[model samples]
Target: NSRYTHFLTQHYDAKPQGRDDRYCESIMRRRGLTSPCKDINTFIHGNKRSIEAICENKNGNPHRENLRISKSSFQVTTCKLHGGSPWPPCQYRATAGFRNVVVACENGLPVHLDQSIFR
Candidate 1:
């Protein structure tokens, strides 16, 4: 979807310096993932097919309600900040793993990433 394309271009496209605690702090701030960076969030990097494939199952069944791609469908990079972490100097942790992703779609195109996890 064009929305996903645009979003990935703006928020998730940066190449991380390194996948470490400091990586999250740097990338989040650089990408503007901070300020209101709340809860746990994840970003995924993969071919369009791998990403779109998440919309279905082995049986090709689509999750009509709140459609989602399973975690095993792609590799994921997660960004998180500790509780009580300050805003101007938001501290974060970057972790990589495989997990399911929940995405919102409109007109069969992915529009928003609702949430993700590491398993």
Candidate 2:
């Protein structure tokens, strides 16, 4: 149930500066996320309260539900890299989103991204 640590490390970021191909390059390099030149990633830009709200049942929320969408629309940046890439030069495109996010829930908490519900 504690699988969210890596999840938290990879996606959640309140102070993400990685805006463009260049920024993505630096950020990925800086964070060692490139593998190098990762194909796609989404950086969550909301407060932790916002994170907890997504899994709210209102309804342990552990096994309360297997998968769910966020009740709140969140601010996130989707970074994608296409085709050609390397450590010397990684390419990527940045997209901004403010909407419900699709996620896998476990133990009353979100554990992973599961693509998109409404983009």
Candidate 3:
């Protein structure tokens, strides 16, 4: 269907770079956290502040004045993090600083994801 095709085009076109380590380091510096997450567990525990800040920044629509510009930028950037389109239906947990998982959409529906992968 055109919907899925459109999603795929957009998703791949704006494919997000998975740089958890770099992101974690940025967070540590921005928020001035005591310790940074060295692994998944440490990330979950130590990155509370960093994660919260990211969520707040992305979801807040902080640039309310420039709706069009901000919205378009967000869609290309943070939209994927908050469950963007053309992807499978899957659940994810906080890991290495990211709060969501990546999956493929099947038959216009998100498939059930295995929770064990996060480990």
Candidate 4:
């Protein structure tokens, strides 16, 4: 859990500040929730397949070979908020960042590892 927390902090810290607002807003609008973001509980409970995992450097460059993993096997309520110009408080909205784990083989492609293995 601590590692996951560290991953989230590092991921967001590495992201560019001038990133595209439209892309972020698009995801928020598509979710169809007026809040534009949800807590870890809401995300998991909603229970549809999600972005789930991603790999990127501080500049948002994809890192396929060294794929960063998802913190949980099934999606949890991530705290990344991404609706408005200035994000709402983390207490209410999700964060617009990612957390990482280790990658494992899935269908011949590197997939995010679940907490079950590490825990």
Ranking by TM-score: 2, 1, 4, 3
lDDT by residue (tens digit), candidate 1, 35-104: 7764456666666555555555531234547665544555667777776855657776778765556666
When 1 and 4 are scored with TM-score, the better candidate is: 1
Q: How many collisions per candidate?
A: 2, 0, 3, 9
lDDT (CA) per prediction:
0.60, 0.67, 0.29, 0.33
The window of 10 residues in a row where model 2 has the poorest summed lDDT is: 57-66
> How far is 114's C-alpha from truth in model 3 (Å)?
21
Worst 10 residues of 3 by lDDT: 68-77
The C-alpha TM-scores of every prediction are: 0.69, 0.76, 0.19, 0.23
Clashing pairs in 4: 40-77, 79-94, 79-95, 80-94, 80-95, 80-96, 81-94, 81-95, 81-96
lDDT of 4 by residue, 3-111 (tens): 4443333222222342234433343344442252432212222121222232322212333574444444432333334335333332234333223334433333333
In angstroms, give how far residue 4 of model 1 lies from its true place: 2.3
Query: How does candidate 3 score on lDDT?
Result: 0.29
Q: Cα RMSDs of all predictions?
A: 3.5, 3.8, 17.5, 13.4
lDDT of 1: 0.60
